[PDB]
Amino acid sequence: GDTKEQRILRYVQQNAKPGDPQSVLEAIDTYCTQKEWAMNVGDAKGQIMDAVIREYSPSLVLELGAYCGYSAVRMARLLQPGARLLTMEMNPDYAAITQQMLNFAGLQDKVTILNGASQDLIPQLKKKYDVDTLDMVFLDHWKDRYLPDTLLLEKCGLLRKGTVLLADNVIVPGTPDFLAYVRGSSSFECTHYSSYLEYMKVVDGLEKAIYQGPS
Ligand SMILES: O=C(NCCNC(=O)c1cc(-c2ccc(F)cc2)cc(O)c1O)c1cc(O)ncn1
Ligand SMILES: [Cl-]
Ligand SMILES: [Cl-]
Ligand SMILES: [Mg+2]
């Protein structure tokens, strides 16, 4: 039968207003609070994401790991006109749900959902996708991929002074190598935002790591 992610999309389509991103976020959070948990960033951490997005008003955001498109809705709804989000989702079924979710939210013109592995796609961003540098990166894919993909971003010349990395799940499931690395690096200025795992009474957190250039 249907998957959890199909159930979430359907619930959104039947309980949100088309073209209304806030209603989409609310529908998802209700579903996941009342019916079934799912690994969306959630409202607690989402509120911190919102605050970050509004501070930096990034023109170009890369997201690693889309899932059902919750975080992509969350960020894209706060982008300025003309600003854009690219999100890399290697799971094809998740990629399809994410696209449908963004279409329902009316945010399809702001977001490009690429179905491929981040390690394969990151090296194509400059030449294929005409990226110069990224303003912000949201990390939310496999937790053992945050560090290697961060180092790949730098290798490929995609980070600039001031590029904001914002990492989900640095407590649960945790990203110990990434977290130790950025906190130890003179090339990052880090801030920890303590919060809660989505839809749970469990502590989690976001890490912001602002790239400072080589050193
Ligand atoms: O990105 C891919 N999976 C989700 C990564 N995200 C997570 O695993 C994740 C997990 C949890 C979590 C927390 C507590 C718990 F008890 C169980 C899970 C929370 C979150 O907020 C996440 O973000 C992926 C899929 C695929 O098929 N191929 C390549 N990549
Ligand atoms: Cl999400
Ligand atoms: Cl929550
Ligand atoms: Mg997460």
Domain CATH number, residue 197? 3.40.50.150
Do residues 73 and 49 make contact, with C-beta atoms less than 8 angstroms apart? Answer: no
How many folded domains does the chain comprise? 1
Long-range contacts of 126-130 (CB under 8 A, 24+ apart): 126/156, 126/157, 126/158, 129/86
* Coil, strand or helix at 23: helix
Ligand-binding site membership of 118 (annotated): yes
Q: Quick one: which of 163, 150, 213 has its CA closest to 186?
A: 213
How would you classify the pairing of strands 164-167 and 203-211?
Answer: antiparallel
* Coil, strand or helix at 85: strand
Nearest CA to ligand 1 atom 22: 39
Chain Cα centroid distance, residue 27: 19
Token pair in block for residue 42: 């959630």
191/170 Cα distance (integer angstroms) = 12
Residue 44 CA to ligand 3 center (angstroms) comes to 4
E strands, the chain, where?
A: 60-64, 84-88, 111-114, 136-139, 164-167, 188-196, 203-211
The atom of ligand 1 lying closest to the CA of 142 is 5
Resolution of this model in Å is 1.5
Ligand-binding site membership of 117 (annotated): yes
Instruction: Sort residue 91 into left (φ over 0), alpha (ψ -120 to 50) or beta.
Output: beta
Nearest CA to ligand 1 atom 8: 142
Do residues 210 and 162 make contact, with C-beta atoms less than 8 angstroms apart? Answer: yes
Ligand-binding site membership of 44 (annotated): no
DSSP string, 145-182: GHHHHHHHHHHTT---TTPEEEES-IIIII-HHHHHHH
Catalytic residue positions, numbered: 140, 143, 168-169, 198
Q: How many other CB atoms sit within 10 Å of the CB of residue 151?
A: 12
Provide the residue range defining the domain that includes 7: 1-215
Token pair in block for residue 28: 């998802």
Do residues 135 and 169 make contact, with C-beta atoms less than 8 angstroms apart? Answer: no
Burial of 3 (0-12, 13-18, 19+ CB in 10 A): exposed
Residue 142 CA to ligand 1 center (angstroms) comes to 6
| Cβ of residue 5 lying under 6 Å from some atom of ligand 1 | no
